[PDB]
């Protein structure tokens, strides 16, 4: 109930929203059906259009007009945006040569440059190039400011998940908006685009920018606009707030456009009807910049031009139906479309088994256009598991396709030609970033980066301290002229032991067996003292950021940090030069495992546990294949280099170590490799403590990893070898799930050269992802600036074409 019979006189677009049943005059009132009786009349004026004309110049002020061409209008802050162009002989902002903005050029009484976020739904990254002839204002922003060739959205590449990530710096799994449509078992409530329940505050976690501003004494314009408020009115409102007295004037604002997403859905991303929406958007930017120019704010305000996701070609005929796979299709609920989420129709149904559903959806048709997953088996890069609102069964849908439950669903709703929501590494889902103003750089191109990083930068631009979030603060310092955030490296929490030879061979009873001169004895001892360490540890040893007990172990070919708690390395580091040669494991050494006389029997794995464990075998972190000599090859068979592996995963690992490491060393002019295990049994993307481990090698205290990582580093200038690099670095990394079968890879019964590298590409990762998962901090000792290293650690190698 609203007493909609109060009034909006003097209250139009009120910054503080008022409490029911008293009527509302804020930019969201329409959406709640709660505006005052007179809202349309006083706040949504249209009389005489949106532009001044020759005849309107110096007119007598008429309050009924949409915007004004009278003399006083500038003081009042309510001129039409073209007033000075038409009535005072001024040029449009787009027609002015651009000039570097070295410092904020603001009116007296501004305490900080204001920030305007101009957000656009479904603005695909390639429109910057492809639509460049019809977007001259945006093109001026882009070429004169700081721009990225594209920006990476979060998964799923839907509107609310992405808008709310921009606002908060958080993964959907942490902020809680995990979809456009959602079911929450704890509330027993649903969240939908149509309807009331989305307005409820319990859906929305983290701390969005407007709340971060307010709490720290920075005033915010209201970010959200009702769909029926026209674009010109949104602009004029923002220009109006900017004219308020110093004590009431907001410092941060948002504009939002429904376009080009709205038309993209109907016509596809490049439909010929797409030109017009792009024209209209550019026109709106023009109006803003002309309006800012009139108020002398065009060299004062920082402007961010940002999209939420791109748009892909999708039609009705490209639909996969679950009714073609499952005979039980009525016992499941599906959240459908560009992703699939499956739960049980009824929790009272005790016959429902996710395992049998997964199996029935796996590699059934030769060109199947989706892949089922338990959510914890999804690529770690998506960060899409740790929320009770994300269903245990997920379907990753191929770009260009839809998944539905039954054919009836599609033709009882062909309509659409565009959709979005696929994997966030897909080119067509990529979106835009342009920064323009005194705080951004001038005429600068920056590399692609993820939208989770922006909250920190908007905090920096406003002098705010950010709420805890998933950005890496400082990784975007290269976008900024000043207001950079200078972080310090985290401090090491545990220091390592450096054990010497302390145990006799016969003290080991491990069920392990192996068939195994002063010049070359002083030699091998210095190798064990760490003489080649500078070759294999190029960037310093990683720092252990938690409390634990570990050893540094040195060898001719590799160095490791060996965990006495988990009985295996946390990390193993080695360098493979361009010229290195692959050998095989000799026959006399096939089943060789050797005791490590630096490490107590009690802190060692044992062969008897692997013999007993019928499902579990073992592999090596440093590959024996890449030993630098027959004598150094013995080091690779030490029990301290051993880790548990399913026979199915060994096929993956062996191919990576035997074939791919050498391949990258040739292509890259040497590589440094750091490999290790990851334990994430509760799928929170964070390192498990020992009491969190759900699985051990049978009859032993040997914990089983959920994943294995590798970080592969070389010189960005590939004419220099990896161990003699003078400048910036180049990285690619992966987090491979440690699985007892290869069901994920439909081609797996073929040769490894046909499926392994594809799987690895899918499980590509940022070094930062690996840091969360291990509690390690890499690249401690380089010659490079720390901000540059933070950017390197947030890099993702996506394996998409240009
Ligand atoms: C991305 O960045 C984010 C933000 O930094 C990272 O997430 C943080 O991770 C922390 C570690 O998981 C976590 O810290 C916990 O906080 C608990 C208090 O939490 C409340 O307060 C915060 C701050 O105001 C608030 O933001 C939280 O909001 C969450 O919950 C509501 C829903 O309930 C949502 O509206 C909101 O979206 C958010 O949900 C998300 O987070 C929770 C986890 O908190 C998930 O479960 C959800 O699925 C969703 O992802 C909260 O309202 C605090 O209680 C915890 O303390 C326990 O654990 C520690 C171990 O150190 C121990 O000392 C304590 O004893 C305590 O254990 C007790 O409770 C256990 C469970 O009940 C029990 O088993 C024990 O026996 C003990 O009794 C803990 O400190 C922090 O909340 C989140 N923050 C956010 C915003 O998510 C995230 O990790 C980053 N991701 C990556 C990959 O880096
Ligand atoms: N109607 C709407 N009006 C505004 C927004 C919006 C969401 C997020 C942000 C950002 F980027 F700052 F976080 C700005 C504006 N979304 C919708 Br939907
Ligand atoms: Br939002
Ligand atoms: Ca974990
Ligand atoms: Cl969804
Ligand atoms: K075994
Ligand atoms: Na397979
Ligand atoms: Zn859309």
Curated annotation (Swiss-Prot):
A Pfam short name: Phosphodiest
Active site: 159
Motif (Cell attachment site): 76-78
Tissue specificity as recorded in UniProt: Abundantly expressed in cerebrum and cerebellum. Localized in secretory epithelial cells in the brain and the eye including choroid plexus epithelial cells, ciliary epithelial cells, iris pigment epithelial cells, and retinal pigment cells.
CDD domains on file: Enpp (cd16018), NUC (cd00091)
Positions annotated to bind 1-hexadecanoyl-sn-glycero-3-phosphate: 159, 180, 261, 420
Activity regulation: Inhibited by vanadate. Inhibited by micromolar levels of bile salts, such as tauroursodeoxycholate. Not inhibited by taurodeoxycholate. Not inhibited by hydroxysterols, such as 7-hydroxycholesterol, testosterone, dexamethasone and prednisolone. Inhibited by EDTA and EGTA.
Effect of residue 121 to N: Abolishes lysophospholipase D activity
Key words of the record: Calcium, Chemotaxis, Cleavage on pair of basic residues, Disulfide bond, Glycoprotein, Hydrolase, Lipid degradation, Lipid metabolism, Metal-binding, Obesity, Repeat, Secreted, Signal, Zinc
Region listing for Phosphodiesterase, in residue ranges: 94-447
Site (Essential for catalytic activity): 793
PTM notes: N-glycosylation, but not furin-cleavage, plays a critical role on secretion and on lysoPLD activity. The interdomain disulfide bond between Cys-363 and Cys-746 is essential for catalytic activity.
Residues annotated as binding 1-tetradecanoyl-sn-glycerol 3-phosphate: 159, 180, 261, 420
Limits of the SMB domain: 4-47, 48-92
The record's free-text note on cofactor binding: Binds 2 Zn(2+) ions per subunit. Binds 1 Ca(2+) ion per subunit.
GO biological process per UniProt: cell chemotaxis; cellular response to cadmium ion; cellular response to estradiol stimulus; estrous cycle; immune response; negative regulation of cell-matrix adhesion; phosphatidylcholine catabolic process; phospholipid catabolic process
Entry's Gene Ontology cellular component terms: extracellular space; membrane
Main location: secreted
Result, substituting residue 265 to Q: 20% of wild-type lysophospholipase D activity
Segments of this protein annotated with the region Required for secretion: 770-791
Official protein name in the record: Autotaxin
Organism in which the protein naturally occurs: Rattus norvegicus
